[PDB]
Amino acid sequence: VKLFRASEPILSVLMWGVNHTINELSNVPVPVMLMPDDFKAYSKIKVDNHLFNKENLPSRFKFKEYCPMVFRNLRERFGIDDQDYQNSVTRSAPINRFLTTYDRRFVIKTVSSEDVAEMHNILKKYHQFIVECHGNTLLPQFLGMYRLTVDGVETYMVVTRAVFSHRLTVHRKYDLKGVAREASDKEKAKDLPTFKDNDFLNEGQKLHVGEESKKNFLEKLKRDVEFLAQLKIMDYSLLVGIHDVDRAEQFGPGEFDPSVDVYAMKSHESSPKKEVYFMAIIDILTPEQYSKRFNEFMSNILT
Template sequence: TVHLSVSPVSVVSFSFPSFICIGLLHCQAHEKKIGHRRVDASGETTYKKTTSSALQGSIQLGIGYTVGNLSSKPERDVLMQDFYVVESIFFPSEGSNLTPAHHYPDFRFKTYAPVAFRYFRELFGIRPDDYLYSICNEPLIELTNPGASGSIFYVTRDDEFIIKTVQHKEAEFLQKLLPGYYMNLNQNPRTLLPKFFGLYCVQCGGKNIRVVVMNNILPCSVRMHLKFDLKGSTYKRRASKKEREKSKPTFKDLDFLNDVPEGLTLDQDTYGALVKTLQRDCLVRKEERGVG
């Protein structure tokens, strides 16, 4: 066996934006106003002045249209220009010859790199019908304790997908990452980078609300014994007293070093595969940052 030790000098550090995370770290948010997210006295959530219910409905209508429309087109190889394509469709509330009538405010729905994301979904074994059924068949569940990012999180009823609002810079980051992400998936199918299934934008009331669809790697069916939020740093990386008092606390780097001093024990093959995967994933980030 091989010990995979975690120490202040040997930790592999990732610095992805907040939307690229391992699972969802649930924390109690007492604020009624965080970033663009608002919760009024009645408990209704709005994001950029669009109600959560209207946003949910717009996302489901938009994804239903764009994925269904793409399914009618023949599959082909992904080209470089596919990463920069943005498709747009207008959804008037009274409906049109392309879109159904709905009871939400008029909105425009944009789909980023539809052909590229279709390829990603296929690579991850997600069929178009399953994707549509999970997201569009039943109302989404809004997480009431999304954390301090000011984003809105939705989870599909079958616990398969997470949909999160992202800032403009985060969406730009993902778009810029796509070519390298594509190459990495082809060369490194065991990648530990998050799985992205779609990037969309709802334009409503003069505002752009961008959302990303990701895999939910911590579904409710998975029992959590211990939970660590590891950043690869030891500066102020210890769970607070308040956090420790929770029934299911989230520990941090210094807690891991203290509670698991011998690291994690892995067999030789697993250790080798893990290190190789991490090295390849780091190369994607280095290339995106232009680091030699």
Template sequence: GGGRPGRRRRACRRTTPMENIKRIASASGLGSMLGSVLGGGPSASERPRNSDGAGPSAGGREEDEDEESSHEKTATTNLISAGHESFELIFMMLMGIRTSVGRFCAQVPDARELAPTDFEQQWEGDFLGKGSAETPAHGNCDFRFKDYAPLVFRQIRERFGIEAPDYMLSLTSEYVLVEMFTNSKSGSFFFYSSDFRFILKTCTKREAAFLMAALPQYHSHLMQNRYTLLSRIFGLHRVQMRSGRRVFFVVMGNVFPIDRPVHERYDLKGSTRNRFTTDEERQDPNVVLKDLDWINSGRKLHLGGDKKRRLLAQIKRDCALLEKLEVIDYSMLVGIHRTSTKGAPPASEQRRTSTYHKVGSSAHG
């Protein structure tokens, strides 16, 4: 992407809600939120970072850390269960989600029309090790959890057929996640649910503020566009650890299917400048290819006339929203699954689901 448009405004001038959204978007490097992948966020097979201790800790990003940095490209994953250095943070994330989702399902059992105040609603709970009137006992370190616009995100989940029991089961049935650090410049960490249906992605305070400011328009777009290619964000949360550190994170849907391997992945930005992978990078079976790789391969998507028209129309509608929000750092993630048996999928792809389920189960007895 390029620079983000924006104007300097005098402090005494009252700004409209849309101007506030644009101001925050300009300052936040928002591509990693709504537009980093115009297709649903990183895939379960996107390249992770080695977990040998190099680089940022696995606890997510500081709330005011906004600088971008590049990271080395390696390919390992970590199963996070009891005893892992990130388990404390993961436990806080998942217990907070489980409690908050269950709480609002009990309080508001039936879907209702949202009110403007629902987009500003926040629920915050103190999770004491010994428990409290609002939160269960858990025997771990005390922490505080905040859930943003819970009823709004609940409606978004239901829009895409995700009911609360299935959502909680997928995320919190075993309190086990798979950690994956991508080569994204944002420095964000990604944690995958054990069934790879959902992604927990850490974000900055500014990115969280942008999402809240843009939420009414984002929600409206998703309600009107069931087949949107934009990242589907199902929750925005914050954990405050005992040290005082705050970690913001979102829950997103995984764009790629979990029941079949993806043999080729392309991250397409519509630009050709430095948009290629090196011969060395292409040795990695999980490499994410780029625009020039796509062009040089001669690949085309054969969709048929009707699907082509519908796809282009949806892209146009999605991009219209991003343009309105002045988000310009986004790309399209294309995954290719070969139905032919020629060229067997990498062993890592074949084991992707079964291995983590097996290890996740054994980690809990």
């Protein structure tokens, strides 16, 4: 019995809409292939409830879903079950726009009109890419794209699989791009410090994962950025989280489900401090240069 109780009507509508659309798709046969129109399709539903159901939801709102067939396919290829997705969004209000489902499994980012256009611009090539690499990638995993309309105001959203574990606490992150980029004094003091490539290399920090993972990671990181190039995109960073097992050891720690924390990596026997690294590409909605720059700076962290 979902109330869609949220700190904000936009959120409730989001819960309502994700619920509605996922349900609706369950009466829609999974097809043998996606079609060209699927990339131009959408669903729109306008609600107008006079004097009814007003406790959590607005009375009047719109909810549009972009390319529901493509994104539903994307979910499967990413090994995400629609009813899990749905339950993550609808069972409890997402939290802190940049949100996560209450179970830290999915991220919900507000985006712009042009973001949504760029998404449409690259979606067929990105689907084709997901297919070809069998969903094995460091790229953002796009699960859904929506436009909510509440009080006349349109709001765009994009849902990705979270980068950081939904369980194992991160203790240090690093937004990396491969100029001058450090952490500002106005940020350097906070529960979660978001670093950058300068404060990293100068910090003599490395990620010890074994040559066996360097092989998977790089062999992926290469085809991924090569793909972003051919799409003539740039400014994408490499989000990197560290989880020192001890700091939290203070059921087991360092324990995680690779099928859920898809971005996680164990350190190697032949390594110093014992930790879990979370690594993926972020911010891809916007040269062969940026690519090879990126690739190089990131190869150097993997020993």
